[PDB]
Amino acid sequence: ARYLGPKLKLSRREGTDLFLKSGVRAIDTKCKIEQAPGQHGARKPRLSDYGVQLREKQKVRRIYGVLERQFRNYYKEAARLKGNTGENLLALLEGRLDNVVYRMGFGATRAEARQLVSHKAIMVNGRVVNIASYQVSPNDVVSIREKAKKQSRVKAALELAEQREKPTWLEVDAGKMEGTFKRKPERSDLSADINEHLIVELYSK
Amino acid sequence: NIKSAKKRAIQSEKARKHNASRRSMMRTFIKKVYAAIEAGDKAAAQKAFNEMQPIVDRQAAKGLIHKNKAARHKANLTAQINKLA
Amino acid sequence: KIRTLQGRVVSDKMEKSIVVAIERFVKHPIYGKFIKRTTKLHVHDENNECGIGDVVEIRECRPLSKTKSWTLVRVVEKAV
Amino acid sequence: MVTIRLARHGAKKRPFYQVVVADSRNARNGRFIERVGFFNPIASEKEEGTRLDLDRIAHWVGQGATISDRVAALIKEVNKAA
RNA sequence: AAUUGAAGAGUUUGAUCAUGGCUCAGAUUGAACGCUGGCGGCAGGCCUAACACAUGCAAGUCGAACGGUAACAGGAAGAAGCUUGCUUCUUUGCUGACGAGUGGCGGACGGGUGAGUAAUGUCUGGGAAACUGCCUGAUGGAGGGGGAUAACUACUGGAAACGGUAGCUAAUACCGCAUAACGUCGCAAGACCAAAGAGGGGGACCUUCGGGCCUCUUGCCAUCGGAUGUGCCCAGAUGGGAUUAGCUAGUAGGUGGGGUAACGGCUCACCUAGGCGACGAUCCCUAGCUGGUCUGAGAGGAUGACCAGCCACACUGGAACUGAGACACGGUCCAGACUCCUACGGGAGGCAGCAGUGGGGAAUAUUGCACAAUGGGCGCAAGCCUGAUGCAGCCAUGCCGCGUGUAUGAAGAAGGCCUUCGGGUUGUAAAGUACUUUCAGCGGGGAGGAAGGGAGUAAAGUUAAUACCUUUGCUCAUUGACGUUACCCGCAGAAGAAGCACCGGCUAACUCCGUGCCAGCAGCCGCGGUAAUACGGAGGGUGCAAGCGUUAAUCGGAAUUACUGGGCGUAAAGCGCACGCAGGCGGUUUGUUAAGUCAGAUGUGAAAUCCCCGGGCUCAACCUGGGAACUGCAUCUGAUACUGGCAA
Ligand SMILES: [Mg+2]
Ligand SMILES: [Mg+2]
Ligand SMILES: [Mg+2]
Ligand SMILES: [Mg+2]
Ligand SMILES: [Mg+2]
Ligand SMILES: [Mg+2]
Ligand SMILES: [Mg+2]
Ligand SMILES: [Mg+2]
Ligand SMILES: [Mg+2]
Ligand SMILES: [Mg+2]
Ligand SMILES: [Mg+2]
Ligand SMILES: [Mg+2]
Ligand SMILES: [Mg+2]
Ligand SMILES: [Mg+2]
Ligand SMILES: [Mg+2]
Ligand SMILES: [Mg+2]
Ligand SMILES: [Mg+2]
Ligand SMILES: [Mg+2]
Ligand SMILES: [Mg+2]
Ligand SMILES: [Mg+2]
Ligand SMILES: [Mg+2]
Ligand SMILES: [Mg+2]
Ligand SMILES: [Mg+2]
Ligand SMILES: [Mg+2]
Ligand SMILES: [Mg+2]
Ligand SMILES: [Mg+2]
Ligand SMILES: [Mg+2]
Ligand SMILES: [Mg+2]
Ligand SMILES: [Mg+2]
Ligand SMILES: [Mg+2]
Ligand SMILES: [Mg+2]
Ligand SMILES: [Mg+2]
């Protein structure tokens, strides 16, 4: 299921930071990003349109820690749901609990924020939801369970969570360690450096 | 074949003979009628009809000939006799 | 009435064993062109009168003969 | 004789019945004449769980039909009017 | 709101444009195989031999129809075990019950499989000539007799299967007889037909103490109804082939008898000489049909597992009997093929029910659990039965979810790999440090699927009635196969949990070494003869991930059968030429027709499925409310430009 291997290796090949070591340090280095994902990593890949089309979606995928199966389905869904396929894709992708967990800053990385979910230490509108892909929706309210509340990770987590741009469509707390999904993130939130209609094209032929 | 209602096999046979006899006695008395008709006798014809009448209606009720079956008989016969009888 | 067809005779020459044609037109379910799908029907007429080539009106009844479930209702034209 | 009974279109361990009028001799979840309700035995306190077209039912019942032990039960439970 | 949705690439050439086939990206699968493999939820699981089958189980139930006791249970005048209330056997069917037997209902349902069938089928839509158990509306019946028989007893034949004789007995078995209309025959007058009782409780009254009698309940007969089921008839549609063009004697029709529940060449006798067919008969080949399924932008193409509907079959061929229904899957009869038992004389049996076996195959599961639920049979009931069904087991077959850890961690260790020896890479990867513990493990807790039935009691509907019964509340004790259920809590330790294909181009991913037209690769092009990114190993990388690849298979791209949507001068393609039947098409005007065509209305188009908006399982798959859609068909009414007919 979960990728599980070296995390930075990805960011290097995908050419950008993917916040998989999300924790302490910033603007990598302390890594080596770029000039050698492997033994010939330096060499410029004068790569095809298929190549780029492949890597964008791959990028978005290495980002949320999702495998082909689920991702392919996300697309399938977006496409169904009214209005612009490429956007709904991203919408769906964000409605992911584990993501809404990390986004609210309860976890350093998206992974950590996910392990949190898996370990019944999170609760939508009250009851525990231990499955990563649980779809969060408007007005929903996620909160760390008292049982393991203010524990090592989540302190630091909620900490450098403000170091980050800090979202908009939601409302943290940090005391009650709860947060409210106010609205389905607009297109304009997030992204810029992610180019949907490519990963649309990809899954479109 | 070994299964309770082997019984039914023996039952159905009781019935089989039962109906066989009357079913026969019926159509005998029925013949009797066509006999006189083919002969020319108008009297024996009515005679036969009036004895076969009850036994048809009769069997019908008990139910080895069922209703409309009877009717026809009275019907065809009646028509016949008073064609030249 | 309850429904009824017409169509030219095509064969009178048998003791009430009258047979009637019934041309139609139909869309070919695949190439659009309209084409002629004929239907012949064994129809009863008593006292034989409908004649070869007469147009005639026809209604659907209970089984007369094996083959016959229609009777005529009227006639229309003759001496073709 | 035609009867009203629970055809069972649930799902393993989560039954959900289609109550239906039919020829009593037909398969449980088979040929029926009309649907005349449904009965979710999980339903739960939430909301819906025993919609029941009383109008047709008791017209078939008058029409001649008869009723399951477990259907009539839903009726003297549905109360009838309130 | 609810079909508002379409991509191209490689390869003939030195090169080019065209023509054209091959090939690839996609989706889908009841799949197999190689490698690998942790958990769960829903599902799926002989596609082959309609091959053959050991064993268990798949249909019984009713003592409130009947004579009844042989089992085990109480009890009993009475005979006693005797430790004078604890109770032993003789017996007695006295009653709770109940083997066997008669009887009623069910064994025509549920479940299995597509062999046969190109039309006794299916689908769409219609019609007239019919029956229809149980259930239900109405209206009357429900009299009075008779002769039987199984069981049983005696004798008695067989290895068994199963019998023979003679008695002997009950009924809701059976048969007369009465009665006989709003039934059947009949224009009428008339004539003619039925049945069955069993139970619950109960005031006097009284009885041969068995009951009468009162009372309800239930069963029985007839007639007309309903409802469901079924039979029938019509038209259209439902595969291929002309290297099949003629087919047909009950054949087509008429008349009369017979016949069926019914119309009917259904049958017969006679009469007519008909009937079918190039709009495809006949013959051959293949085949269950549908809802739908997969695919496709659509049109289409392909398909008919799992769910539902219809049909057909039940070892093979044939037949009927019983019955409301059968020409009967676990019924009978005949023939056959085959197998088993045998004491040798004779007997028995049919898994295409569940599980299981042999066999065949690339390949398809346990000889499990339970009637707790839903549903079916019987029964007043309680119940009993139910391999239907609910569940469990097996298999990554699939779909969906989840896990196999999270952070931190550098001059970046060692090792490997490359290196122009400067360094690069594996790589934040490892180690190390903090942290979390879902899942599996262990331990505790603990929903729902349960409604109902049982005693009571209450009130009411009844009646002589406060009995009974039915009804509706009240309490009380209860009912779960799944089950170590879901879900909840604690516990320990990152602890038990990653593999497969690929990296020449198409196509995301490159180096070295080995090999040297060998070994070998190869979907297509093409790689291999000394620097091989194409062979094999390695390091690295890309893609997937409890799956990964290979093979097989349908559609796609393929506008490559072109209706949508193509071609024929030189690329495949104009018959050597003409005449012309059928067939197709046909200038122009008016009238009429209204079949095509168009309009509207109505009915119909099963549910499921698909889709839209919702709701329910922690999400999801899955389940589910409601719409939408079923682009079709049919009847009626219209409109008359265009087409068809008619007329001039
Ligand atoms: Mg998965
Ligand atoms: Mg006649
Ligand atoms: Mg070349
Ligand atoms: Mg293995
Ligand atoms: Mg008994
Ligand atoms: Mg009787
Ligand atoms: Mg009488
Ligand atoms: Mg009597
Ligand atoms: Mg006749
Ligand atoms: Mg076949
Ligand atoms: Mg296309
Ligand atoms: Mg099945
Ligand atoms: Mg047979
Ligand atoms: Mg019969
Ligand atoms: Mg069998
Ligand atoms: Mg089996
Ligand atoms: Mg084998
Ligand atoms: Mg089963
Ligand atoms: Mg080194
Ligand atoms: Mg556990
Ligand atoms: Mg419970
Ligand atoms: Mg409850
Ligand atoms: Mg490349
Ligand atoms: Mg290879
Ligand atoms: Mg070399
Ligand atoms: Mg095509
Ligand atoms: Mg062409
Ligand atoms: Mg040429
Ligand atoms: Mg020429
Ligand atoms: Mg539908
Ligand atoms: Mg939900
Ligand atoms: Mg005209």
UniProtKB/Swiss-Prot annotation, chain A:
Keyword Cell membrane part of the UniProt annotation: no
Annotated Gene Ontology cellular components are: cytoplasm; cytosol; cytosolic small ribosomal subunit; small ribosomal subunit
Gene Ontology molecular functions: mRNA 5'-UTR binding; mRNA regulatory element binding translation repressor activity; rRNA binding; structural constituent of ribosome
Superkingdom of the source species: Bacteria
One biological process term from GO is: cytoplasmic translation
Keyword Nuclease assigned: no
Q: Which UniProt keywords apply?
A: Antibiotic resistance, Repressor, Ribonucleoprotein, Ribosomal protein, Ribosome biogenesis, RNA-binding, rRNA-binding, Transcription, Transcription antitermination, Transcription regulation, Transcription termination, Translation regulation
What range(s) does the S4 RNA-binding domain occupy? Answer: 95-155
Read off the InterPro entries from this record. Answer: Ribosomal_uS4, Ribosomal_uS4_bac-type, Ribosomal_uS4_CS, Ribosomal_uS4_N, S4_RNA-bd, S4_RNA-bd_sf
Q: Which family does it belong to?
A: Belongs to the universal ribosomal protein uS4 family.
The UniProt entry, under NCBIfam families, shows:
PRK05327.1, rpsD_bact
> What subunit structure does UniProt give?
Part of the 30S ribosomal subunit. Contacts protein S5. With proteins S3 and S5 encircles the mRNA as it enters the ribosome, which may play a role in mRNA helicase processivity. Some nascent polypeptide chains are able to cross-link to this protein in situ. The rRNA transcription and antitermination complex (rrnTAC) consists of RNAP, NusA, NusB, NusE (rpsJ), NusG, SubB, ribosomal protein S4, DNA and precursor rRNA; S4 is more flexible than other subunits.
Protein name, entry field? Small ribosomal subunit protein uS4
From what organism does this protein derive?
Escherichia coli (strain K12)
Quote the gene name from the UniProt entry: rpsD
UniProtKB/Swiss-Prot annotation, chain B:
Supply the gene name.
rpsT
Q: Name one GO cellular component term.
A: cytoplasm
Kindly give the PANTHER family that the UniProt entry links to this protein.
30S RIBOSOMAL PROTEIN S20, SMALL RIBOSOMAL SUBUNIT PROTEIN BS20C
A Gene Ontology annotation in the biological process aspect, one of them, is: cytoplasmic translation
* Annotated HAMAP family: Ribosomal_bS20 (MF_00500)
Entry-linked InterPro entries: Ribosomal_bS20 (IPR002583), Ribosomal_bS20_sf (IPR036510)
Q: Which UniProt keywords apply?
A: Ribonucleoprotein, Ribosomal protein, RNA-binding, rRNA-binding
Per the record, the similarity remark reads: Belongs to the bacterial ribosomal protein bS20 family.
Record-linked SUPFAM superfamilies: Ribosomal protein S20
What the protein does comes down to: Binds directly to 16S ribosomal RNA.
Protein name per its UniProtKB record? Small ribosomal subunit protein bS20
**Disulfide bond residue pairs:** none
Q: What are the boundaries of the region Disordered?
A: 1-24
Q: Which domain of life is it from?
A: Bacteria
Swiss-Prot record, chain C:
Output the superkingdom of the source species: Bacteria
Signal sequence span per UniProt?
none
Q: Name one Pfam family in it.
A: Ribosomal_S17
Q: Which UniProt keywords apply?
A: Antibiotic resistance, Ribonucleoprotein, Ribosomal protein, RNA-binding, rRNA-binding
The cellular component terms of Gene Ontology attached to this UniProt record, alphabetical and capped at eight, are: cytoplasm; cytosolic small ribosomal subunit
Tell whether RNA-binding is among the UniProt keywords: yes
The GO annotation for biological process reads: cytoplasmic translation; response to antibiotic; ribosomal small subunit assembly
Q: Altering S65F: what's the impact? A: Prevents 30S subunit assembly at 42 degrees Celsius
Q: Which GO terms describe its molecular function?
A: rRNA binding; small ribosomal subunit rRNA binding; structural constituent of ribosome; zinc ion binding
What's its job? One of the primary rRNA binding proteins, it binds specifically to the 5'-end of 16S ribosomal RNA. Also plays a role in translational accuracy; neamine-resistant ribosomes show reduced neamine-induced misreading in vitro.
- Subunit-level organization: Part of the 30S ribosomal subunit.
Q: Which family does it belong to?
A: Belongs to the universal ribosomal protein uS17 family.
Tell me more from the record: The strain missing both S17 and L29 grows very slowly and has a rather unstable temperature-sensitive phenotype.
Its recorded name reads: Small ribosomal subunit protein uS17
Please tell me the species this chain comes from.
Escherichia coli (strain K12)
The record's gene field reads rpsQ
Swiss-Prot record, chain D:
> What drives induction of this protein's expression?
Part of the rpsP-rimM-trmD-rplS operon.
Write down a Pfam family by its short name: Ribosomal_S16
Cited SUPFAM superfamilies: Ribosomal protein S16
Its keywords, alphabetically, are:
Endonuclease, Hydrolase, Nuclease, Ribonucleoprotein, Ribosomal protein
| UniProt cross-references to InterPro entries, sorted A to Z | Ribosomal_bS16 (IPR000307), Ribosomal_bS16_CS (IPR020592), Ribosomal_bS16_dom_sf (IPR023803)
Which molecular-function annotation in GO is an example for this chain? DNA endonuclease activity
Example of a GO biological process term: ribosomal small subunit assembly
Q: Does the keyword Ribonucleoprotein apply?
A: yes
Q: Name one GO cellular component term.
A: small ribosomal subunit
Tell me which HAMAP family the record gives. Ribosomal_bS16
Task: Give the multimer and partner information.
Answer: Part of the 30S ribosomal subunit.
State what this protein does.
In addition to being a ribosomal protein, S16 also has a cation-dependent endonuclease activity. In-frame fusions with the ribosome maturation factor rimM suppress mutations in the latter (probably due to increased rimM expression) and are found in translationally active 70S ribosomes.
What family does this chain come from, according to its entry?
A: Belongs to the bacterial ribosomal protein bS16 family.
Q: What is the protein name stated in its UniProt record?
A: Small ribosomal subunit protein bS16
Annotated source species: Escherichia coli (strain K12)
Which lineage? Answer: Bacteria, Pseudomonadati, Pseudomonadota, Gammaproteobacteria, Enterobacterales
